Ligand binder design. Structure first.
Ligand SMILES: OC[C@@H]1O[C@@H](OC[C@@H]2O[C@@H](OC[C@@H]3O[C@@H](O)[C@H](O)[C@H]3O)[C@H](O)[C@H]2O)[C@H](O)[C@H]1O
Ligand code: CA
Length: 415
């Protein structure tokens, strides 16, 4: 008799897994029907923005932690605190505190107070390597604790870059990193960031940032340890990693089902190479599961969010289907130690969460437009047509204007 709309995003394997788990919810609650709206990850922001702009908000939906404050100011997210407290058996205290706190807001600041969502997951972005490739090449395996230096990383990547079938053409490469998702770790481990400590000033013109960005671009253009510009256009580097053509590529827990299906070589996880700080860095992602402030069925909507986020049955199903690591800390710790479940160094995911993982800079700001502007015109740097130094000088004032506007807009919307 009750109908809920559940809006979310995922790669094909994630869509299938969540659709399966929603069906399990519907078996458990036969009086609730869940109507699904699902998109690809890149489509999602646009489609959710449109829903909110028209005030036709789905009952339950994914959202970005960087939108939490804006969504509260505009009365988008229901305060679900009391529903979560009253629910049978639920124990959020078992869930990653880092995850739960991203969706708490006390009226002034994030991290404390009322719950406005539940964590879908934590998404530590690890570095994988192709063990099959290393062993066929006779290269000593990477250490699972001590990061490569940047120069050591380039050195091994060069050794891996070769013509393996002897037709005279390179057909295997050290790596092929996507700047959108992998620049951050090089920037951070080199002691830089997109913004200052106060999160109000753009700092991409820091020499440490420039060094990190130029190093990144140089992997393709100078050190030549990646497919060429044309080769990556022909077949993108994620696909080339699946086919066993690349030595190194990132791995998120959401990748595991796709990798189970398509990757035939042995791979394992390692820390990211470290810049001047000598400490590895990468991001820990998260999405929240929120409830529409205007839902006609808040109890059932929170029950769906809880089933996906915290319920041991719903959680076990998601972990079994290899699209995330457990939200329960104790379950995650014994998961990581189970050697029958690969990669062998699953533990690296937990090390990222507990130690060297950072948030995206936009998680700190009222909106992300300032950061999107950095990436919007970045490709000429990546393709060697413009220096890192020249680009960040040009981008910085455009970014700063947008950031200033985000800051002002928060002041206005929170009045
Ligand atoms: O193009 C290959 C894909 O890109 C890289 O992933 C980057 C993006 O991460 C996934 O989203 C993960 C979720 O967002 C996190 O905040 C949350 O913790 C996760 O559930 C998107 O599907 C990707 O576009 C990887 O190399 C590969 O998956
Ligand atoms: Ca060849």
């Amino acid at each position: 008799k009750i109908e809920l709309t559940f809006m979310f995003r995922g790669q094909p394997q994630e869509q299938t897994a969540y659709k399966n788990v929603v069906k399990k919810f519907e078996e458990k609650h036969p009086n609730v029907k869940v109507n699904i709206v699902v998109t690809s990850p890149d489509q999602y922001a646009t489609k959710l923005r449109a829903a909110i702009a028209g005030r036709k908000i789905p009952d339950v939906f994914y959202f970005n932690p960087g939108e939490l404050r804006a969504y509260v100011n505009s009365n988008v997210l229901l305060d679900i605190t009391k529903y979560v407290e009253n629910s049978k058996g639920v124990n959020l205290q078992d869930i990653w505190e880092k995850g739960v706190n991203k969706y708490r807001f006390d009226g002034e600041k994030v991290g404390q107070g009322n719950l406005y969502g539940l964590p879908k997951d934590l998404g530590p972005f690890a570095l994988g390597y192709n063990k099959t490739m290393f062993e066929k090449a006779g290269i000593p395996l990477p250490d699972k604790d001590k990061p490569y230096t940047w120069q050591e990383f380039i050195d091994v990547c060069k050794k891996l870059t070769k013509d393996t079938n002897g037709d005279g053409k390179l057909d295997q490469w050290g790596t092929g990193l996507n700047a959108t998702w992998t620049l951050q770790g090089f920037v951070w481990s080199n002691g830089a960031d997109w913004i200052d400590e106060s999160k109000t000033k753009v700092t991409v013109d820091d020499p440490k940032f420039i060094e990190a960005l130029q190093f990144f671009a140089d992997m393709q253009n100078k050190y030549k340890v990646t497919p060429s510009i044309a080769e990556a256009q022909t077949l993108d580097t994620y696909q080339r990693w699946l086919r066993g053509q690349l030595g190194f590529f990132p791995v998120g827990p959401w990748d595991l089902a796709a990798f189970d299906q398509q990757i035939k070589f042995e791979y394992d996880l390692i820390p990211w190479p470290a810049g001047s700080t000598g400490k590895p860095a990468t991001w820990v992602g998260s999405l929240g599961i929120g409830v529409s402030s205007m839902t006609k069925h808040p109890k059932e909507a929170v029950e769906l969010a809880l089933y996906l986020s915290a319920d041991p049955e719903g959680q076990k199903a998601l972990v079994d289907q290899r699209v995330q690591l457990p939200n329960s800390v104790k379950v995650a710790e014994e998961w990581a130690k189970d050697p029958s479940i690969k990669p062998a160094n699953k533990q690296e995911f937990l090390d990222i969460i507990n130690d060297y993982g950072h948030s995206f800079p936009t998680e700190y700001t009222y909106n992300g437009e300032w950061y999107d502007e950095f990436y919007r015109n970045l490709q000429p740097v990546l393709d060697g047509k413009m220096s890192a130094e020249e680009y960040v000088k040009k981008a910085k004032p455009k970014m700063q204007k947008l950031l200033d506007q985000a800051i002002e807009q928060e002041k206005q919307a929170s009045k």
